[PDB]
Design a protein around this ligand. Structure first.
Ligand SMILES: N[C@@H](CSCC[B-](O)(O)O)C(=O)O
Ligand SMILES: N[C@@H](CSCC[B-](O)(O)O)C(=O)O
Ligand SMILES: N[C@@H](CSCC[B-](O)(O)O)C(=O)O
Ligand SMILES: [Mn+2]
Ligand SMILES: [Mn+2]
Ligand SMILES: [Mn+2]
Ligand SMILES: [Mn+2]
Ligand SMILES: [Mn+2]
Ligand SMILES: [Mn+2]
Lengths: 308, 308, 308
């Protein structure tokens, strides 16, 4: 089984443009080289050439709808094509709005996949509940079967088909959820482990519980959408929406080590790394290196060591 | 059920006077506004006008006995009056010596209440075991039935009646206990979870265990006396007696979230916040904001989110 | 039962010479005074006078073989002599290469002892697997019965006899293990709790599990070899080989508190403290004080308090 890195230098899912540099900063930290030292064969697609839409007025409150919807249609066609060739897609972001295209394309080939969304946010606001309009806080909304028809058709997303149900996803890290989002997860009954559940159970029992909940009936492809701001700002400071009291460095590596060991990882997203959001140069380095470490962990590297 | 904020700008329980500014710094951080956004109706009594006692020589080694004993007699009459009107008292301190008056008044209306004392210290030295004389490290001593008559009558505290027994309180966070205090808790058999027990069990099992121990027989009013230095100096640096290896931000919010969910919180203290003890302006901001967050957590705010 | 502090100002087990100052920095922090306040009688042997070997060319890749092998032969004779007099040896290092002599001498008197190696590294590279040649990352190699004859005879270590088997040791803290080391621990089946197992189980269950594994059949002398870089660089920054995502201050004290409570501690090492590796003066102070605290914890001091 081979790996396929797909760079997604996109930022129109939020205000700050530095995220577009996430793919390159991750590559400069030696990501591909290090991944080639693991047990997998690594292929590097390169970065996607995102087509900008000049005339892109806000859809009501939704901003850059057409630029975002197009950028994701491209990504979805590339992930599906790589998934079609039996390779594990590894998407390096921009903003988390790229998960729409990452998961959509993936679910075309493995419609039975489940989603492990690591984030301090649920990113499940719809065009009608969002208060900012930033589409990086709405991906989950465009992906859920149950939320289909709950908001008006957004320009640029006609190609989108909600093919993943609320029972196929688990959240880990939540600590900053909007009122509408909380209402949505409770009504639809989306499984989650906010920081409260992590403190209550411990990361160990948390992973055991998300696997039994998602892989209890039958084993299936796993799509991990890791938002760097899932970890505490002390570890991943270079992100546009840091929330205090998050997952630790250790807890993050635990999550990935466990997903690795399942043997089911099929798709992976490393989102929201913004190399221009460091208070100090070292804060950017600390963030990048942590993202690279989490990515490697997903593909073999264990803290107990490794050997051939 | 309504909430009642009672400011207690008192500092004569220890050396440093900045604590008297704790109530105002907490209000400046938007405490009342934020509390009014929760599901409770919030009333703000204001700050107590503490009568200073000019001639207040040390009782043996005890300092400012009369000023402290008077200040607490006032507070006790106000908390009892608010408790008498079916409202939840929320006392913002100074030093922890104000817990004597906070709990005493509370126990007049709910003599069946239990106490969850979150602190890095036991604050159970008596006038005869204390080595500093600072009454903020002796409140528990003036409140316990079993410790009545174990030390001579201190001027200013004649109004005090030890109405809470050693079996009604649980400690969480302990990591700096004096020899006499350790002897006292072991002889009286006061339940506690020092940092050792938190590391052993995990905060989750710790709360489950203090609730079963205190609310096992019958459910009763809970009085939470939270000492800001209960959390690690990394979170609550602006306190006069910080000890390393304390509760985390996450663990602190867990404690309050769980007390909230019990539906039994009857009285609350937010003590030892000293807005003049910050190494840097941000350390003061970090401390205040954490105290405000813990207070809000006690009244509804959950990390998983909320909605109407 | 008495305690015996044996200073081991040695650094030839690695590049940086500051470690030779570890014993003195620890004494300057008031170690002996504080240890004399515990329930034990404390004896201070002083620092060993290490004989330097002028002509000491690398054995193949192994550096300072003869200087290290001699320094440890001395230490082994002193620890065995103190162990012979029924006292608990407390060796203050330099580099971890001194554990060879510390444990060897100890095992002469208590050949039934088990080893609790707290470190971010396994220090089990042999003269043929090591890539650096630094003997502080090879002690365990010269001590294991199963690894006898697996590498050529190193000058300076003829006196060495591997008397401890792979089933008598448990590792805690691992997060930076070499390929050969990982192969060695898995083939020999050495018990370990890397950071992954600590996150999975919690430090509490981790200690319960190492005690049942090592003291299940019969109770026996415990030799704790604590490498300061076992804790996160945030607590013990002044070490030559810091790895991120390590044990916390709390977790470290937990380990020692539990070993204390077993009543079986027979030998103890406080290694890799380098008072010249502080980014700032406070980082050195933070490291020393943490090492002193861990040492005291091993001899009585509990976070819940103490009394006579
Ligand atoms: N609640 C926020 C969502 S911020 C989420 C950002 B990120 O993609 O990093 O999770 C909103 O409505 O914009
Ligand atoms: N053991 C100390 C008590 S310091 C406690 C301070 B605080 O109120 O913050 O817990 C003494 O005798 O002054
Ligand atoms: N893997 C390293 C070992 S570094 C271990 C250092 B210390 O003694 O602190 O554990 C090597 O071959 O030099
Ligand atoms: Mn996100
Ligand atoms: Mn996020
Ligand atoms: Mn206190
Ligand atoms: Mn305290
Ligand atoms: Mn070592
Ligand atoms: Mn080490």
């Amino acid at each position: 089984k081979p790996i396929e890195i797909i760079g997604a230098p996109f930022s129109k899912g939020q205000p700050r443009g530095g995220v577009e540099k996430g793919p390159a900063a991750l590559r400069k930290a030696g990501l591909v080289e290090k991944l080639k030292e693991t047990e997998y064969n690594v292929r590097d697609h390169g970065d996607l050439a995102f087509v900008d839409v000049p005339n892109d007025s806000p859809f009501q409150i939704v901003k850059n709808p057409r630029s975002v919807g197009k950028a994701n249609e491209q990504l979805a066609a590339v992930v599906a094509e790589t998934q079609k060739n039996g390779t594990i897609s590894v998407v390096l972001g921009g903003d988390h709005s790229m998960a729409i295209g990452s998961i959509s394309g993936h679910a075309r080939v493995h419609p039975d996949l489940c989603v492990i969304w690591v984030d301090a946010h649920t990113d499940i606001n719809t065009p009608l509940t969002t208060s900012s309009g930033n589409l990086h806080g709405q991906p989950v909304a465009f992906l859920l079967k149950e939320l289909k028809g709950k908001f008006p058709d957004v320009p640029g997303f006609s190609w989108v088909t909600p093919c993943i149900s609320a029972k196929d996803i688990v959240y880990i890290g939540l600590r900053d959820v909007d009122p509408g989002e909380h209402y949505i997860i409770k009504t639809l009954g989306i499984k989650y482990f906010s920081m409260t559940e992590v403190d209550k159970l411990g990361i160990g029992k948390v992973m055991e519980e998300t696997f039994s909940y998602l892989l209890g009936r039958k084993k299936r492809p796993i799509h991990l959408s890791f938002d760097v701001d899932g970890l505490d700002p002390v570890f991943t400071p270079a992100t546009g929406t840091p929330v205090v009291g998050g997952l630790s460095y250790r807890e993050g590596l635990y999550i990935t080590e466990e997903i690795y060991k399942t043997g089911l990882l099929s798709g992976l997203d490393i989102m929201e790394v913004n190399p221009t959001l460091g208070k100090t140069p070292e804060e950017v380095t600390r963030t990048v290196n942590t993202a690279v470490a989490l990515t490697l962990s997903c593909f073999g590297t264990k803290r107990e060591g490794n050997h051939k």
